[PDB]
Amino acid sequence: AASSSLVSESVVSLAAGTQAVLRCQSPRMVWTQDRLHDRQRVVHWDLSGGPGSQRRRLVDMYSAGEQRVYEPRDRDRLLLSPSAFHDGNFSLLIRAVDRGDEGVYTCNLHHHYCHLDESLAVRLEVTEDPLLSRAYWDGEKEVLVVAHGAPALMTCINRAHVWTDRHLEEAQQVVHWDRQLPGVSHDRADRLLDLYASGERRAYGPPFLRDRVSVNTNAFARGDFSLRIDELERADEGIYSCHLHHHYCGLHERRVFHLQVTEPA
Amino acid sequence: SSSLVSESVVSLAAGTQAVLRCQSPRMVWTQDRLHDRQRVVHWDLSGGPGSQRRRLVDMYSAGEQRVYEPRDRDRLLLSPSAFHDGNFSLLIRAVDRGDEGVYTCNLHHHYCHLDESLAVRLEVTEDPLLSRAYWDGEKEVLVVAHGAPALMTCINRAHVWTDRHLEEAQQVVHWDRQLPGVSHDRADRLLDLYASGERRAYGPPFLRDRVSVNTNAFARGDFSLRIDELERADEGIYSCHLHHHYCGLHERRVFHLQVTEPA
């Protein structure tokens, strides 16, 4: 993979002399990352439905939570590893497979903080001849042939750091504001501000614009890095971009503002 | 068909009583049926000639599987219906270095007194591309990545282990007689002894009165043929055939009987 990005784009038209507020806020921009609530992951196993019908959720488990089975008959029957989010082993164990367990299973990982979705499909087939039990690749997914009544383990492993409870060093979060003046292509944007979570601001370029640009650094703690431009001039027109790279999530966040300054009649 | 257990020559005087010994404790049948289809599977773990085997998990037929180490609960699993289809394989949910060793799957039949076992050696590696299943010459060897599952296969679909009913052909003992000149296959049946108690004697009354097996044959497993008042016409090849179809017991004993007249 090269990059994963969350991008939002907006058109802003404001009268000259008024104030511009370019809102840039995200839970990723909250520096003190709660290892509990900012690390909520969920795994759930789904089973294919009937012809053209809806899938059925069998069991799910949130990180730092206990597994939940949705059919009371399947309690103590479908098992996840309680250490799944520590080692990255999200495999599903069926204690005794019957015909009602045949179908295509999906193992689904969701990172609610990092906006990451992962899915793996496994087809389970029940045989009444134990000699025919086997596992093979069908061209797109693993196929597991299991003797009726036997336990079956469908393997789902993802050991990437974002799914496990392994944490690298929490480095400094920096938020960048860029600007493209009218008629300047992308990749040639000029930096406007570097905004550090600890409160430091590094200004760039024009001293005739810096005096009207401001941020509220007391709102950095809640992930708000919005840009404020006072006394809007025609020269303020352009494409403003707020962007951040989140190391743990492996995620680029980008908010783009096409700002137009009008003049009253 | 059957296994020929012995073939002996018996020479006796006319007028005496022949006793052709045919005994088997595994042909005993009595009134009671105290779990006479009771089986048990158990998996053991051992580690070389100088280590002690440890019982891992067992399960009786018509019972629930019991695991011996509380850590292994929900970790070592058998098919709860293993005795229906003969799938006695053992699933280790996730293996570690402590699971290395030789695993033996043991079947034991409390009624038939049968035992059958196979061994599997588990080896836990670190590289997943080194994971293979091969035959070392006398047992299967499983190389499994750490934390991966290990399915140690133990499949025995024979009717004696499974809840499949091959009708109910009970124990029966046959005594046959092959007279001189008579070719085999055309040997005359002398006695049918069924475990249920039914007996079938063959021949004219002069012969049936002189040929007997003790009345408690199946209680004691003694089916010896007694021939009273030996005549020269009694000589020939006698054969005892023991059949326990459920337990797979099929034995025969052959007696070459010679009758010598007093001079």
CA–CA gap between residue A192 and residue A181 (Å, rounded): 12
Q: Within 13 A of B8's CA, how many CA atoms are on the CB side? A: 11
Give yes or no for B36 touching A (CB within 8 A).
no
CA–CA gap between residue B213 and residue B226 (Å, rounded): 6
Q: What is the 3-state secondary structure (H, E, C) of A10-62?
A: EEEEEECCCCEEECCECHHHCCCCCCCHHHCEEEEEEECCCCCCCCEEEEEEE
Give yes or no for B79 touching A (CB within 8 A).
yes
CA–CA gap between residue B117 and residue B138 (Å, rounded): 13
Q: Please, are residues A21 and A10 in contact by the beta-carbon 8 Å criterion?
A: no
Amino acid letter, B83: F
Give yes or no for A132 touching B (CB within 8 A).
no
In the numeric block, which tokens belong to residue B2?
Answer: 């059957």
In the numeric block, which tokens belong to residue B40?
Answer: 């048990």
Amino acid letter, A89: N
CA–CA gap between residue A99 and residue A116 (Å, rounded): 33
Q: What is the DSSP string of B161-178?
A: TSS---TT---EEEEEEE
Amino acid letter, B207: L
Q: Which of B74, B79, B148 sits opposite A150 (nearest CB)?
A: B79
Closest by Cα among A84, A138, A74, A67 to B93: A84
Q: Please, are residues A245 and A3 in contact by the beta-carbon 8 Å criterion?
A: no
Q: Please, are residues A208 and A232 in contact by the beta-carbon 8 Å criterion?
A: no
Q: Please, are residues B210 and B257 in contact by the beta-carbon 8 Å criterion?
A: no
Q: Is the dihedral of CA A48, A53, A59, A64 positive or negative?
A: positive
At residue B8, the 3 state secondary structure works out as strand
Contacts with B80 from chain A: Cβ below 8 Å: 95-96, 149
Q: What is the DSSP string of A49-96?
A: -STT---EEEEEEETTS--EESSGGGTTTEEE-TTHHHHTB--EEESS
Chain B residue with CA closest to A147: the answer is B87
Q: What is the DSSP string of B99-137?
A: G-EEEEEEEEETTTTEEEEEEEEEEEES-GGG--EEE-S
Contacts with A128 from chain B: Cβ below 8 Å: 85
Contacts with B94 from chain A: Cβ below 8 Å: 81, 89
Detail the DSSP E strand segments found in chain B: 3-13, 18-20, 39-46, 54-60, 66-67, 76-78, 90-92, 101-109, 114-125, 133-135, 140-145, 150-152, 172-178, 188-194, 199-201, 211-212, 225-227, 236-244, 249-260
Q: Which residues are CB-neighbours of B14 under 8 A, at least 6 positions away?
A: B230, B231, B232, B259, B260, B261, B262
Closest by Cα among B260, B239, B259 to B250: B239
CA distances from B27 to A83, B5, B20, B21 (A): 54, 15, 17, 14
Give Cα A92 to chain centroid, integer Å: 24
Quick count: other Cβ atoms within 10 Å of Cβ B240?
A: 28
CA distances from B99 to A49, A53, A90, B145 (A): 38, 43, 21, 12
Give yes or no for B80 touching A (CB within 8 A).
yes
CA–CA gap between residue B16 and residue B239 (Å, rounded): 20
Q: Please, are residues A86 and A66 in contact by the beta-carbon 8 Å criterion?
A: no
Chain A residue with CA closest to B149: the answer is A153
CA–CA gap between residue B178 and residue B155 (Å, rounded): 43
Cβ distance B94 to A96 less than 8 Å, yes or no, reads no
Q: Which residues are CB-neighbours of A198 under 8 A, at least 6 positions away?
A: A31, A172, A220
Q: Which of A89, A130, A153 sits opposite B85 (nearest CB)?
A: A130
Q: Please, are residues A232 and A19 in contact by the beta-carbon 8 Å criterion?
A: yes
Q: Which helix (H) or strand (E) is A124 found in, with range?
A: strand A116-127
Map out the domains of chain A as residue ranges: 1-33+169-265, 34-168
CA–CA gap between residue A15 and residue A20 (Å, rounded): 9
Q: Which residues are CB-neighbours of B159 under 8 A, at least 6 positions away?
A: B165, B166, B246
CA–CA gap between residue A146 and residue A137 (Å, rounded): 15
CA–CA gap between residue B27 and residue B112 (Å, rounded): 9
CA–CA gap between residue A161 and residue A246 (Å, rounded): 14
CA distances from B195 to A72, A216, B17, B19, B63 (A): 49, 98, 26, 21, 28
Amino acid letter, A24: C
CA–CA gap between residue B39 and residue B23 (Å, rounded): 25
CA–CA gap between residue B147 and residue B90 (Å, rounded): 16
Q: What is the resolution of this structure in A?
A: 2.2
Cβ distance A150 to B74 less than 8 Å, yes or no, reads no
Dihedrals phi, psi of B197, to nearest 5 degrees: 115, -20
Rg of chain A on CA atoms, in Å: 26
Q: Please, are residues B139 and B121 in contact by the beta-carbon 8 Å criterion?
A: yes
CA–CA gap between residue A17 and residue A12 (Å, rounded): 15
At residue B67, the 3 state secondary structure works out as strand
- Edge-to-edge strands, sheet with A41-47: A68-69, A56-62, A41-47, A103-111, A116-127, A142-147, A134-137
**Mutation site, B81, B88, B95, B153, interface A, largest A CB count within 10 A:** B81
Cβ distance A147 to B80 less than 8 Å, yes or no, reads no
CA–CA gap between residue A83 and residue A85 (Å, rounded): 6
Q: Which of A93, A96, A147 sits opposite B93 (nearest CB)?
A: A93
